[PDB]
């Protein structure tokens, strides 16, 4: 477990060294300035001052000796036997380390132990931590809260959750938190059935991985040049969301896009098309999710076979079947045979858990050689200041720490990059053939490929560069923009060939807009 600590240490000491340079300050002044930017929420600002108190004196002497973060953290025993992040010949590596020895020479608390043990299960099971009625929908934003699924309007009632069939069409209280309830004043007719009946409502559900949940570390947290108090305001919400931003993803996103592009999420297209689908979105996605381990949390899916509407399900395991952290990485890659066996088991679980009239769309896997081609000679946020860390050096560093999320594509071995894409193609064809030659009772099966090159063409006509489609910090996942151009590219395709999956526009939208408006928001 030295990798995660070693990485974290090098990240922090890097920020420290760089904040000192940006402001022409001392190492002490930088550490005080760093904590100054962090918020108090979740005790982050307290932990900062503690670490400065515990390690500050040692860090100041080492950085004053021109040592870089990687050497510092190996001297401070945060990195254990070496992995270079900055260029340095091994002879120069030994001297600096031997010079650091002559200079220098959590949840266990009984009162905090159990809540730690309680938080662990809620996340690991992919269920909201704040959920009194245990309907898996929450009134809280993060901790698997309503950022991932529609917010719960009645947290006390375990029969009230988005996607539920109208219970007597909500004469007295909103049954599915979709913002429509009550009766028509003129005629005494329930608002719900008046508006939403016969429209064939359908929900959007995501079975995906980190990319599906829009994993995103803001580069602002790592670029000292533009750091401020406003850089870390969203840090507490991010940590409690597992560094995921599903509210902004391309599938289950419901917030306005910061990126500025006009494309909207599938859920937004879904809700826009039929105001009854309001809040009928679910993000059943976890970091590291693959065809092998989806079963370990697919139970978090909340959809009752009898009391809920149909659903549009997207199976989006877009890499972890080829992307792994092992040194001998190819053996860990899922084979087409294992891919077939794992998906069929996953589909079988859905036919037993999804109401009839549902639809499942299998995503293909993209050609991840795009990662190295676009980024290998560009500078990681931690290297942008002094232009001393390229994504190539960043991939090698992570590889050394056994932390590289995709040894197959985030690699300088072209032969392996090709080998990894070939496997990604073979797995995509398996998903294609399944949708064609496999039939199920409660839903039909379709396949749309990723086709990253198509999204790049759409991006280049817009005046953008391909490297602007990848998360800057990890250089691996697609960013908010790429996710939306994909969701758009997917939505258009299903429309042109399988419009019944999405349905057809409900003409009461305007009549629902006229009467209810925002419908309680999200
Ligand atoms: C590149 O990857 C291939 C496939 O795993 C392997 O056979 C080859 O030895 C690798 N080359 C180097 C220089 O590691
Ligand atoms: Ca609830
Ligand atoms: Ca409820
Ligand atoms: Ca309702």
Swiss-Prot record:
<dbReference type="InterPro" id="IPR048593">
    <property type="entry name" value="AOAH_Saposin_N"/>
</dbReference>
<dbReference type="Pfam" id="PF00657">
    <property type="entry name" value="Lipase_GDSL"/>
</dbReference>
<feature type="disulfide bond">
    <location>
        <begin position="6"/>
        <end position="79"/>
    </location>
</feature>
<feature type="binding site">
    <location>
        <position position="160"/>
    </location>
    <ligand>
        <name>Ca(2+) 2</name>
    </ligand>
</feature>
<feature type="disulfide bond">
    <location>
        <begin position="323"/>
        <end position="406"/>
    </location>
</feature>
<protein>
    <recommendedName>
        <fullName>Acyloxyacyl hydrolase</fullName>
        <ecNumber>3.1.1.77</ecNumber>
    </recommendedName>
</protein>
<feature type="binding site">
    <location>
        <position position="152"/>
    </location>
    <ligand>
        <name>Ca(2+) 2</name>
    </ligand>
</feature>
<feature type="binding site">
    <location>
        <position position="154"/>
    </location>
    <ligand>
        <name>Ca(2+) 2</name>
    </ligand>
</feature>
<dbReference type="GO" id="GO:0009104">
    <property type="term" value="P:lipopolysaccharide catabolic process"/>
</dbReference>
<dbReference type="InterPro" id="IPR011001">
    <property type="entry name" value="Saposin-like"/>
</dbReference>
<dbReference type="GO" id="GO:0050528">
    <property type="term" value="F:acyloxyacyl hydrolase activity"/>
</dbReference>
<feature type="glycosylation site" description="N-linked (GlcNAc...) asparagine">
    <location>
        <position position="356"/>
    </location>
</feature>
<dbReference type="InterPro" id="IPR039676">
    <property type="entry name" value="AOAH"/>
</dbReference>
<dbReference type="InterPro" id="IPR036514">
    <property type="entry name" value="SGNH_hydro_sf"/>
</dbReference>
<dbReference type="GO" id="GO:0006631">
    <property type="term" value="P:fatty acid metabolic process"/>
</dbReference>
<feature type="disulfide bond" description="Interchain (between small and large subunit)">
    <location>
        <begin position="83"/>
        <end position="400"/>
    </location>
</feature>
<feature type="region of interest" description="Lipopolysaccharide binding">
    <location>
        <begin position="120"/>
        <end position="124"/>
    </location>
</feature>
<dbReference type="InterPro" id="IPR008139">
    <property type="entry name" value="SaposinB_dom"/>
</dbReference>
<feature type="binding site">
    <location>
        <position position="192"/>
    </location>
    <ligand>
        <name>Ca(2+) 3</name>
    </ligand>
</feature>
<keyword id="KW-0964">Secreted</keyword>
<feature type="disulfide bond">
    <location>
        <begin position="35"/>
        <end position="48"/>
    </location>
</feature>
<keyword id="KW-0479">Metal-binding</keyword>
<keyword id="KW-0732">Signal</keyword>
<dbReference type="GO" id="GO:0008653">
    <property type="term" value="P:lipopolysaccharide metabolic process"/>
</dbReference>
<feature type="binding site">
    <location>
        <position position="178"/>
    </location>
    <ligand>
        <name>Ca(2+) 3</name>
    </ligand>
</feature>
<feature type="binding site">
    <location>
        <position position="176"/>
    </location>
    <ligand>
        <name>Ca(2+) 3</name>
    </ligand>
</feature>
<keyword id="KW-0325">Glycoprotein</keyword>
<feature type="binding site">
    <location>
        <position position="174"/>
    </location>
    <ligand>
        <name>Ca(2+) 3</name>
    </ligand>
</feature>
<dbReference type="GO" id="GO:0005576">
    <property type="term" value="C:extracellular region"/>
</dbReference>
<keyword id="KW-0378">Hydrolase</keyword>
<dbReference type="GO" id="GO:0050728">
    <property type="term" value="P:negative regulation of inflammatory response"/>
</dbReference>
<keyword id="KW-0865">Zymogen</keyword>
<keyword id="KW-0106">Calcium</keyword>
<keyword id="KW-0443">Lipid metabolism</keyword>
<feature type="binding site">
    <location>
        <position position="155"/>
    </location>
    <ligand>
        <name>Ca(2+) 1</name>
    </ligand>
</feature>
<feature type="binding site">
    <location>
        <position position="152"/>
    </location>
    <ligand>
        <name>Ca(2+) 1</name>
    </ligand>
</feature>
<feature type="binding site">
    <location>
        <position position="170"/>
    </location>
    <ligand>
        <name>Ca(2+) 3</name>
    </ligand>
</feature>
<feature type="disulfide bond">
    <location>
        <begin position="196"/>
        <end position="276"/>
    </location>
</feature>
<feature type="active site">
    <location>
        <position position="210"/>
    </location>
</feature>
<dbReference type="Pfam" id="PF20825">
    <property type="entry name" value="Saposin"/>
</dbReference>
<feature type="region of interest" description="Important for enzyme activity, localization to cytoplasmic vesicles, and protein stability">
    <location>
        <begin position="3"/>
        <end position="35"/>
    </location>
</feature>
<feature type="disulfide bond">
    <location>
        <begin position="153"/>
        <end position="177"/>
    </location>
</feature>
